[PDB]
Amino acid sequence: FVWAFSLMFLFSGRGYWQELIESIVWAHNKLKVAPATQPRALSIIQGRAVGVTHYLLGGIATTWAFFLARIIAVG
Amino acid sequence: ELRFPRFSQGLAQDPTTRRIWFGIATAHDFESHDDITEERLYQNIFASHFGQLAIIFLWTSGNLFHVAWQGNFESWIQDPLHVRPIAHAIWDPHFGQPAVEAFTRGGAAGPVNIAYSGVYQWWYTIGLRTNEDLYTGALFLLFLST
Amino acid sequence: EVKIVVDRDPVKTSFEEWARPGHFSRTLAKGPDTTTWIWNLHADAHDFDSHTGDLEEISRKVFSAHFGQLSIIFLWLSGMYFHGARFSNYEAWLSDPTHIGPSAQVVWPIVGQEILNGDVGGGFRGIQITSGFFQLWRASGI
Amino acid sequence: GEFITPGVLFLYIAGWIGWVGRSYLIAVSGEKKPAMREIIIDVELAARIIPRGFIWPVAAYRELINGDLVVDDADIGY
Amino acid sequence: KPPPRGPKRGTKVKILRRESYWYNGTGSVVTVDQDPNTRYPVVVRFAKVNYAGVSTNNYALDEIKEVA
Amino acid sequence: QAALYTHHQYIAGFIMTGAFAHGAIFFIRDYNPEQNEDNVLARMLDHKEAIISHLSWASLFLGFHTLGLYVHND
Amino acid sequence: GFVPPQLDPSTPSPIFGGSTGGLLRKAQVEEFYVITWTSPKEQVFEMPTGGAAIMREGPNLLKLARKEQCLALGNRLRSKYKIAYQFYRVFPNGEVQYLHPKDGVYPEKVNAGRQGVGQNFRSIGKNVSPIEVKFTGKNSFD
Amino acid sequence: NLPSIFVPLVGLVFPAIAMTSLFLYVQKKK
Amino acid sequence: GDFLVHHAIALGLHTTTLILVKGALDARGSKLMPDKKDFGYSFPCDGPGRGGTCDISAWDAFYLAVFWMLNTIGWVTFYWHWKHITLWQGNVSQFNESSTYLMGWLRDYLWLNSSQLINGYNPFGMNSLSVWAWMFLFGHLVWATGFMFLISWRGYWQELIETLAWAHERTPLANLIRWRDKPVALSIVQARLVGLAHFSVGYIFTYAAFLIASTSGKFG
Amino acid sequence: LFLIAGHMYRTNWGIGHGLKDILEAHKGPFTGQGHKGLYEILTTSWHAQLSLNLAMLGSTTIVVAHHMYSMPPYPYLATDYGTQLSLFTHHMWIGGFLIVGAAAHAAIFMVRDYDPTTRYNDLLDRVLRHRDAIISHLNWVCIFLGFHSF
Amino acid sequence: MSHSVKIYDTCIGCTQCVRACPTDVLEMIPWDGCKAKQIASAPRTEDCVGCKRCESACPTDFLSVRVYLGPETTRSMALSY
Amino acid sequence: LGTADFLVHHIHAFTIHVTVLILLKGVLFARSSRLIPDKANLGFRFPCDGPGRGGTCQVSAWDHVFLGLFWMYNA
Amino acid sequence: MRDIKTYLSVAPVLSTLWFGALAGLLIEINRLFPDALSFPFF
Ligand code: CLA
Ligand code: CLA
Ligand SMILES: CC1=C(/C=C/C(C)=C/C=C/C(C)=C/C=C/C=C(C)/C=C/C=C(C)/C=C/C2=C(C)CCCC2(C)C)C(C)(C)CCC1
Ligand SMILES: CC1=C(/C=C/C(C)=C/C=C/C(C)=C\C=C\C=C(C)\C=C\C=C(C)\C=C\C2=C(C)CCCC2(C)C)C(C)(C)CCC1
Ligand SMILES: CC1=C(C/C=C(\C)CCC[C@H](C)CCC[C@H](C)CCCC(C)C)C(=O)c2ccccc2C1=O
Ligand code: SF4
Ligand code: SF4
């Protein structure tokens, strides 16, 4: 799940996520719950940084669970 | 203009290979063609549509031709639940010998492909009964394409 | 020559900066403009090079920082030795090391998760470890 | 007690979280920079507001009638 | 003899420029330029920040609605 | 059966995406904000915030709990 | 109008061991650029195509294959060493064209007498929607 | 019989003439 | 089981709609760029300023949409096949229990039903199913090439070509051949389109192979 | 062996080497000025040392994982299949990452600390000047191996 | 003309775009519509590479220098070979 | 060590080389290239230089190591 | 003393303290009323 999750950050771009954030922000203005640290999308080099990090975490852990459970049972 | 693509001068003078890639993707976008006018915009679309019907009729004349030249259609009718419908024949000169045996099935003489598009049942229902109905079925659609 | 000249009390031990987030950087210190601020706080936490422009302070920070990294490892080691002593079948493992799995973690039974306590044998139960400390503690004659 | 009773139990709680948080943001809204009072939460002010979520169904429903639960066309900036 | 034009100072104003970042928002007038040729006189300061970080810009007289 | 039902759904998945895709090209190239003054079409550009957010809500509510109940079952 | 350009002579280029970032076949067919500057002291700088070469006293000359490269060095010289520079464009046949200051004055400050090519005297929000330009050679900005 | 002729023609020749035909047309200049 | 899957189906339609509907209504303009209409349906981006504007064209909204379409239709056809493949065997209990936890779908549908497919050819022999076994991997290969164009963006490859276009210009016997059209890396939008073409093709061929081979292997 | 090696570099008494002078004798015809000047750029920049240390410590971790599975050093480690697989896998990953780190900090040094007017080096200069050759040749091999391995 | 660079009337004459053009496109000309009495101008759009940094440094309401990407030439593509 | 081992040893020689290529390119071209002549001035980790000159996404040395991680994860 | 309290009031430190209390509470309830699939009081 984490591995497949990282793809959302690598494939897509920031300018789409910034705009969708704006519409979400508007609804909070309606109910007065708009925060004062203005919401922003992640910076360009952060979208990548989060993208690679999850991808590595999903890939390595999958092998981790694949190896230990296999070898422990057969020896 | 002055070269491929004939329909977009801005792309034509692009010296890099970008022109070739972009001369293919923007072929059918008739609005952004240079010198387009609202009369041309429709008349190209109308001519283009007839091009798309030609493909559809030529495509369906392919299916009838093979099913009635390399298929099990007359035999499949005789027992629909035990004769794999046949799509066409295989002639691939890379095949070794054990593959030639393996892909020979459906009561054919050489390798074949089993048809999973379900044409065999549809033509059974709507009344076709031999090969010969299919051949004229091929010719007619071929004529309609013409 | 080679000697030991150090300084005395460069930076005064105080809690003020602990309540001024982003004190280290001049840009971050002004406050949280947007949520972009709370990401740049961690991205430039350890970049001692960008905080100041001279080698002396960068040195003293990396030198002291390593001590923290060194300290955590010792704390990590301490747990591993402690855990192997209070929650392990080590002494049982020393009898038949061929066919008793090394176990040094035991979970509390809250939500059924005691099924994790495997029958690693040796009259014990628990998560079967694989870091191989037990062969290390035997090779040192513990 | 399978869905409806646990469900109402949630909706009570969910507003309590929702209604309290709204009160705080409004409470600190009128300050020199509301930015600082959200990354460094005011604990005392959040303590005199933490129980006001006990009666959120009553309080909110009066706001809706009085027409202060929402705004109309003044959205960004102020 | 002619009095200064536009709002004086501190008067909250509702922004009316459509493409601005603070459309339908409110800012504070910090100074109005009294040169007739100046094409965007009213210097408006805001409380939020636009995507560039800027928090002020000029504006035209008919794009400013003087709320009170 | 399987090769047919699966075939037509994927065709339908592609075609349905095109319908919105040429909706966007409409708003760009051929829409006219004067000849459509306040009619039903211009209003769908007037409360675009209300449409977008609620779509975001319904997706979020389905996402949290469909996945939620699933991990719990797992 | 006092704008007689500099009229490039043939001077000696800087000492350099040569690198792989020099001109390519584009120079022999399309165009290549030279940037002539005068130094008071023989120092060492860094070349836009990587590596370091040493400028020598007085009139230098150096050829680069683009315009971004001539200026990229042009900023470094004007900034680091407080030194003047032009650059040109050289055609395959041999006709050389004066490029950079274009008036004798850097484009940052204002000369009374240059043109106004490329301006719209209206705010950006007032452009015409794409329906108003269809089937014409116009664009919204044009 | 007939496949052994038509398979190569559409697999080898008809591609070759096609690629070489387009390559001249794409790379023309007038 | 059929309750939980249907919401997963329902989740797909809203989220897929959300991207497309967000794309359509913001095509004319939005706060990040209130004159988006002056650039057309498809443009790469608007530069790094104002915080970066990658993937802003209404084109890109269609772009991200296809991924959720393939996933959504993935969850639909998956459901139809497994429910029927248990029925046709008369083993309807297997779906009705395994289909409530994810490992049930991964173990009892994917892993279990692909036993006959992957043996299309082994160091012992081949079968009729070999062609579907080959296409199965061929599906995995194109799909995995798709990532290369989505993740690695243009500016890296462009610097790579320039070195190459230098090496070719200095190699003897090979400086006698000159490109007519200069070589450049694909454009930003082209890579997205190309990258999605591989992803879709590999995603159809992979499933289409597993769907036919697994069912036809048992013909039941 | 280590202890004797400790007594090499001059510290306060007469005996011992000078790390500066060792780097200033190896200069060759193809290389020009040789390792002159590397003493500075390896002394007034932490990002140089961190990049250089990371590669060696990165590489050593890998060699550790190749030896601990072939010369089992602890008793009853051989027949512990759970341990052998994990220990070999663990240090490969650790070794892999640390090498990548050596690329990042070497890259950071080129941007921040490198300066050819004061900390001038000749080898690091020559390496920059023919970088088009280095990548293109490494590009061809990666293609050659790509076709003949996969 | 390779790319089209357009400068509007909002511009406040700050000379931040001109200083940020890496290939010397824009330049400054006198005006009378600002306090600074100068507005930017783009008389050399041929060499305009398209690097939007020219207008990531225009500090106005929306923008006062705008860049529209058209067809690409051998210099507007920044080819060195 | 038979044939089946010979192939896989030449797989490792392949992924190691490719990983070296990405990281090595980043180190050398971290200050300048024929595309961007003043890349050094832009810092160590910057997203891009805009969509000009065909598109300059991911030219910063940080994005070369960002790419290397996958191949390190691959090798 | 004031600076210590302020630091303890910054967002991350409250989070672990708040969530930690929340985790303890839920774990206790599940220890006393386990399996809890329905709400059988009314
Ligand atoms: C006081 C807190 C608060 C309140 C009242 C709201 C209210 C609202 N949000 Mg919301 N939101 C918040 C915080 C809050 N938000 C935070 C912190 C985030 C970032 C994760 C979001 C992200 C978010 C999204 C993405 C969306 C909403 C939406 C909505 C609207 C529909 C309700 C909904 O879907 O809930 C959404 C609930 C969540 C996303 C759960 C996260 C909220 C956390 C758990 C609450 C935080 C409370 C705060 C930290 C406590 C302060 C205590 C104080 C004493 C210190 C509604 C106007 C939706 C909308 O537009 O519908 C119209 C929508 O799409 N919000
Ligand atoms: C499965 C996915 C996949 C594949 C096949 C490739 C393939 C390649 N990548 Mg790559 N890449 C991928 C995913 C993939 N990548 C992803 C996800 C990322 C993001 C991290 C990258 C990032 C990346 C970088 C950063 C680099 C590469 C490089 C390379 C190339 C070096 C290998 C080589 O020369 O082998 C040759 C090609 C193959 C082995 C492909 C299979 C070819 C077989 C043997 C035969 C093909 C059919 C044959 C031609 C017959 C034609 C039939 C006719 C009808 C046309 C190669 C083209 C490197 C490169 O190009 O420089 C050398 C490089 O620098 N890639
Ligand atoms: C209950 C029932 C019934 C009924 C049913 C119904 C009535 C249904 C409905 C349904 C429906 C009712 C559906 C719908 C759907 C829709 C859709 C699917 C949509 C689409 C849309 C679109 C695609 C759009 C587009 C666009 C855009 C985007 C923008 C503008 C332009 C355009 C328009 C193009 C009956 C009685 C009969 C029978 C029994 C059962
Ligand atoms: C009965 C029932 C059911 C049904 C249900 C339904 C159908 C519902 C609907 C519903 C709806 C249709 C709703 C609507 C809504 C709307 C709105 C509009 C709302 C609003 C709200 C608000 C506005 C709130 C706010 C707040 C508060 C008050 C608290 C928290 C905070 C805040 C501020 C957020 C079922 C079958 C499931 C089951 C059985 C039971
Ligand atoms: C999804 C996505 C986002 C959206 C993700 C965002 C905006 C951040 C995710 C939300 C985080 C989790 C904030 C929530 C945490 C807050 C501190 C609130 C805490 C309250 C909790 C205790 C509930 C981007 O910004 C982005 C940027 C560039 C490339 C790709 C993407 C991208 O794919
Ligand atoms: S895009 Fe670049 S070249 Fe063009 S004007 Fe802007 S800064 Fe200058
Ligand atoms: S990274 Fe690429 S897509 Fe993003 S802003 Fe830069 S040029 Fe545009």
Residues L15 and J142: beta-carbon distance below 8 Å: no
Is C38–D39 a contact, with Cβ atoms under 8 angstroms apart?
yes
Torsions phi, psi of G116, nearest 5? -120, 40
> Exposed, middle or buried by CB within 10 Å (0-12, 13-18, 19+), for B52?
exposed
Choosing among B1, B2, B3, which should be mutated to test the H contact, i.e. which has the most H CBs within 10 A? B3
Beta bridge partners of C39: none
Is L17–J141 a contact, with Cβ atoms under 8 angstroms apart?
yes
Element (H, E) at C126: strand C124-128
> SS3 of E10, please?
coil
**Residue I98 is which amino acid?**
S
- d(CA I29, CA I35) in angstroms, rounded, equals 5
Closest chain F residue by Cα to residue A20: F52
- Technique used: cryo-EM
Residues F46 and I43: beta-carbon distance below 8 Å: no
Select from I213, A45, K44 the least CA-distant residue to L63: A45
Q: K79: which residues sit within 8 A by CB, 6+ positions away? A: B16, G26, I182, I184
Q: Which of E21, E23, E25 sits opposite D78 (nearest CB)?
A: E25
Give the DSSP letter string of J69-110.
TTS--STT-TT-HHHHHHHHHHHHHHHHHHHHHHHHHHHHHH
In G, which residues are within 8 Å of I165 by CB distance?
24
Query: Please, what's the b/e burial string for C59-96 (b: 16 or more CB within 10 A of its CB; e: otherwise)?
Result: eebeeeeeeeeeeeeeeeeeeeeeebeeebbbebbeee
Contact G129/F at CB under 8 A: yes
Question: Total domain count for chain K?
Answer: 1
- d(CA B103, CA B109) in angstroms, rounded, equals 10
Angle at J114 between CA J112 and CA J120, to 5 degrees: 165
Beta bridge partners of E57: E44
Torsions phi, psi of C81, nearest 5? -70, -40
For the Cβ of I215 lying below 6 angstroms from any atom of ligand 2, the answer is no
- d(CA F64, CA J107) in angstroms, rounded, equals 42
In F, which residues are within 8 Å of I37 by CB distance?
27-28
Q: Which of K10, K34, K60 sits opposite E38 (nearest CB)?
A: K34
Select from C111, C140, C138, C113 the least CA-distant residue to C127: C113
β-bridge pairing E64-65 and C124-128: unpaired
Element (H, E) at I145: helix I130-151
Atom of ligand 1 nearest to the CA of A24: 60
Q: Which two tokens stand for residue J135?
A: 């990548």
Q: Which two tokens stand for residue J11?
A: 């510290």
Residues L23 and J55: beta-carbon distance below 8 Å: no
Select from I177, I176, I194, I198 the least CA-distant residue to I185: I194
How close L73 gets to chain A, by Cα (Å)?
7
At how many degrees (to 10) do helices J131-149 and L3-28 cross? 160
J140 assigned to a ligand binding site: no
- d(CA A68, CA J86) in angstroms, rounded, equals 7
In E, which residues are within 8 Å of K56 by CB distance?
52
Query: Please, what's the b/e burial string for J31-61 (b: 16 or more CB within 10 A of its CB; e: otherwise)?
Result: eeebbbbbbbbeeebbbbebbeebbeebeeb
Beta bridge partners of E15: E64
Angle at C50 between CA J50 and CA L28, to 5 degrees: 50
Select from C28, C53, C59, C58 the least CA-distant residue to C43: C28
Q: E43: which residues sit within 8 A by CB, 6+ positions away? A: E29, E30, E31, E32, E33, E56, E57, E58, E59
Select from C49, L66, C33, M8 the least CA-distant residue to C41: C33
Q: Which two tokens stand for residue I192?
A: 């997205």
For the Cβ of L47 lying below 6 angstroms from any atom of ligand 7, the answer is yes
Q: Name the closest ligand to CA I58.
A: 3
Is G129–F33 a contact, with Cβ atoms under 8 angstroms apart?
yes
Give the DSSP letter string of C87-124.
S--HHHHTT-TTSS--EEE----SSSGGGGSEEEETTE
Q: Name the closest ligand to CA I143.
A: 2
> Exposed, middle or buried by CB within 10 Å (0-12, 13-18, 19+), for G37?
buried
Q: F34: which residues sit within 8 A by CB, 6+ positions away? A: none
- d(CA G71, CA G108) in angstroms, rounded, equals 14
- d(CA I214, CA I113) in angstroms, rounded, equals 6
Q: Which two tokens stand for residue I151?
A: 């993740």
The DSSP code for I18 is H
The DSSP code for C13 is -
CA distances, F63 to each of A11, D17, I9 (Å) = 20, 21, 11
Q: Which two tokens stand for residue G111?
A: 């000369």
Q: B23: which residues sit within 8 A by CB, 6+ positions away? A: B4, B5, B8, B11, H26
Residues A38 and I68: beta-carbon distance below 8 Å: no
CA distances, I131 to each of A45, B87, B102, B113 (Å) = 44, 15, 11, 10
Torsions phi, psi of C124, nearest 5? -140, 175
- Classify the C-alpha dihedral G107-G108-G114-G120 as positive or negative: positive
Q: What is the dihedral of CA D48, D50, D52, D55, to 10 degrees?
A: -160
Cβ pairs bridging I and L (under 8 Å)? 60
Q: Which two tokens stand for residue K34?
A: 């600002």
Is C33–D35 a contact, with Cβ atoms under 8 angstroms apart?
yes
Report the first-to-last Cα separation within chain F, whole angstroms.
31
Place of tokens 């190749």: J66
Q: J128: which residues sit within 8 A by CB, 6+ positions away? A: G19, G50, G51, L28
Resolution in A: 3.4
- d(CA G102, CA G115) in angstroms, rounded, equals 12
- Taking any CB pair shorter than 8 Å as contact, residues of chain C touching chain A are 32-39, 43, 101, 128, 130
Radius of gyration, CA atoms only, chain L: 16
Closest chain F residue by Cα to residue I62: F21
Find the J51 Cα to ligand 3 centroid distance in Å: 61
Q: C30: which residues sit within 8 A by CB, 6+ positions away? A: none
Is the peptide bond preceding residue M40 cis, with omega within 30 degrees of 0? no
Q: Which two tokens stand for residue B1?
A: 């203009």
At how many degrees (to 10) do helices L61-74 and L3-28 cross? 170
Contact L2/K at CB under 8 A: no
CA distances, L33 to each of G40, I88, I154, I155, I184 (Å) = 29, 63, 15, 11, 15
Q: Which two tokens stand for residue H9?
A: 């023609």
Q: D32: which residues sit within 8 A by CB, 6+ positions away? A: none
K34 assigned to a ligand binding site: no
The residue extents of the domains of chain E are 1-68
Q: Could you give the maximum distance between any two Cα atoms of chain A, in Å?
A: 62
State CA K46 to chain mean position distance. 12
The DSSP code for K52 is G
Breaks (C-N over 2.5 A) in chain D follow: none
Angle at B118 between CA B113 and CA B124, to 5 degrees: 115
Is D41–M40 a contact, with Cβ atoms under 8 angstroms apart?
no
Residues E38 and K35: beta-carbon distance below 8 Å: yes
Contact J118/C at CB under 8 A: no
For the Cβ of K49 lying below 6 angstroms from any atom of ligand 6, the answer is yes
Report the first-to-last Cα separation within chain G, whole angstroms.
31
Count each helix (H run) and each strand (E run) in chain G, helices first.
2, 8
- d(CA M8, CA D22) in angstroms, rounded, equals 23
Q: From the CB coordinates, do chains F and B have 3 or more pairs under 8 Å?
A: yes
> Exposed, middle or buried by CB within 10 Å (0-12, 13-18, 19+), for L61?
buried
Q: Which two tokens stand for residue A22?
A: 């704006």
A6 assigned to a ligand binding site: no
Q: Which two tokens stand for residue I15?
A: 């989220």
E-state strands within G68-123: 88-90, 96-98
Q: Which of J116, J120, J129 sits opposite G19 (nearest CB)?
A: J129
Q: I12: which residues sit within 8 A by CB, 6+ positions away? A: I68, I71, I72, I75, I76
Contact A60/L at CB under 8 A: yes
Select from F64, C38, I23 the least CA-distant residue to A42: C38
Place of tokens 């109008």: G1
Torsions phi, psi of I213, nearest 5? -65, -45
Best mutation site among L56, L57, L58, L66 for ligand 7 pocket (most ligand atoms within 8 Å of CB): L57
Find the K14 Cα to ligand 6 centroid distance in Å: 16
Q: Name the closest ligand to CA L59.
A: 7
> SS3 of K47, please?
helix
For the Cβ of I73 lying below 6 angstroms from any atom of ligand 7, the answer is no
Q: Which of K33, K35, K59 sits opposite E52 (nearest CB)?
A: K59
Residues I114 and I214: beta-carbon distance below 8 Å: yes
3 state SS for chain B: CCCCCCCCHHHHCCCECHHHHHHHHCCCCCCCCCCCCHHHHHHHHHHHHHHHHHHHHHHHHHHHHHHCCCCCHHHHHHCCCCCCCEEEECCCCCCCHHHHHHCCCCCCCCCEEECCCCHHHHHHHCCCCCCHHHHHHHHHHHHHHC
Residues K41 and K54: beta-carbon distance below 8 Å: no
Choosing among A23, A26, A28, which should be mutated to test the F contact, i.e. which has the most F CBs within 10 A? A23
For the Cβ of L2 lying below 6 angstroms from any atom of ligand 7, the answer is no
B117 assigned to a ligand binding site: yes
- d(CA D65, CA D56) in angstroms, rounded, equals 14
Residues G22 and G49: beta-carbon distance below 8 Å: yes
E-state strands within I119-220: 121-122, 125-126
Q: Give the number of other Cβ atoms within 10 Å of residue K50's Cβ.
A: 26
- d(CA H19, CA H10) in angstroms, rounded, equals 13
Contact B19/I at CB under 8 A: yes
**Residue A71 is which amino acid?**
I
Q: I143: which residues sit within 8 A by CB, 6+ positions away? A: I198, I199, I201, I202, I203, I206
Give the DSSP letter string of D11-70.
HHHHHHHHHHHHHHHHHHHSSS-TTHHHHBT-TTTTTTTGGGGGSHHHHHHHHHHHT-S-
Q: Which two tokens stand for residue G126?
A: 């007032």
Q: Can you give the length of chain E in residues? A: 68
In E, which residues are within 8 Å of I34 by CB distance?
18-19
> Exposed, middle or buried by CB within 10 Å (0-12, 13-18, 19+), for D4?
exposed
- d(CA I77, CA I75) in angstroms, rounded, equals 6
For the Cβ of L52 lying below 6 angstroms from any atom of ligand 7, the answer is no
The DSSP code for J116 is T
Chains with 3 or more CB pairs under 8 A to chain C: A, D, E, J, M
- d(CA I203, CA I181) in angstroms, rounded, equals 34
Give the DSSP letter string of C25-90.
STTGGG--SBTHHHHHHHHTSS-HHHH-S-HHHHHHHHHHHHHHHHHHHHHHHHHHHHHHHHS--H
- Domain membership of residue K22 as a residue range: 1-81
- d(CA B63, CA B118) in angstroms, rounded, equals 11
